[model samples]
Target: MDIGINSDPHPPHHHDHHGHGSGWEVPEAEIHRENPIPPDARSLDQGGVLYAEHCVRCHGETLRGDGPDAHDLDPPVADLVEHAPHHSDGDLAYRVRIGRGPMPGFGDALDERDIWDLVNFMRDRAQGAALAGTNGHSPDHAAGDHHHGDHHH
Candidate 1:
């Protein structure tokens, strides 16, 4: 049996059908992280390790947005090094928890340490660092104004 997997972090969004024009406005406070990473456990090395074990299969070797399995996907996996910055910690964490479309849920499998490490790893890659969580992590938003069709549903 063949199961399809997608890379879109937010599959619910169909950027091509912008007939909606604008996104529903929501207060940042409402979107902020309810359970932020612990003060000391935010390391990039840990992030890299967890990513290799869990994400590289579909997100590419370096989160460059190209993975071998991507051809079978729809919206496609995005380059975290370029796109992760535009998203906030809350957004990243939410998708990680609830999942989007083809993305699976790690909520039960991975504990707090695992998820945060991946997020930090992505942030480090965006910053041009090899993988050093020692540098710390932040959920600062990166860029926007991009578009893609719905893949995951």
Candidate 2:
């Protein structure tokens, strides 16, 4: 008899329905460090509202990257509902605050708290933990102590 050491646990066990298969779990401490903002009903609601007013045009109303304007976006938008949880919280927050390609950054515009709430909103929509899109590491420790240029996002 042999136990398959290399067997794909998710498919074999038929447990990961949402596609968050093996090796996707982020460390709890890392998540907390990156996502300093706590979650609540109020944050989730605010995030939803902000996403609707600010990101719905490009990121889609359902956070699936199917917004009406998303079609015209050259870089294309990401499917927040399905893909948001694969990343770390810091990366997600950074992208939301910094923006990328067709995505607009809210660093200067939206308050940090608001942006954090939006992060939660996207994660909630995906039914995953408060996660990120995989920027890996962030200088969160020095983010408050260190200084930087006045570059705009």
Candidate 3:
């Protein structure tokens, strides 16, 4: 006699696919979720290493979505610098866990901590670029006007 244990026909929720950009929707809980780990130097450094390995292929070295393989992608890789700020850290983490379209989910490959670190790294890169100005010009207005110790603390 053959006995069937438990047969499930439904696909797992995590296995569901999404389209790139506007088509991708993050859960409300995830969107509001806060990153537990702080964006420290160590985390950023480790994240940078991971980015070079997993992301640079499609997201490109500068997060411009101009990597060698990016051209062939139908939906196209996202320019993270332009997109990251718009999303909460949680949203980014969720997306990374559940990749959309051609992007493969890293949930199976990377641990939670690693994902958080990567999020920190991406934030730093995007914010840094914005602060530096996109046109190769310094955004700092006080570049040459250094006030020498106006108030001694």
Which prediction has the highest lDDT against the true structure? 3
Residue 67 displacement in candidate 1 (angstroms): 2.6
lDDT of 2 by residue, 5-91 (tens): 865644745455574332433445645566666678777788777778856787776456777776776577766555554555666
lDDT of 1 at 63: 56
Candidate 1 TM-score versus the reference: 0.51
For each candidate, the alpha-carbon lDDT, in order, equals 0.56, 0.63, 0.68
- Best candidate according to TM-score: 3
RMSD of each: 17.2, 17.2, 14.4
Error of 1 at 88 (Å): 1.0
After superposition on all CA atoms, how large is the RMSD of candidate 3? 14.4
Candidate 2 clash pair list: 87-132, 87-133, 87-134, 88-132
* TM-score per candidate, chains pooled: 0.51, 0.52, 0.61
Candidate 1's C-alpha lDDT?
0.56
Per-residue accuracy of model 1 over 113-148 as CA lDDT, tens digit each: 666666666665666632322123433343442245
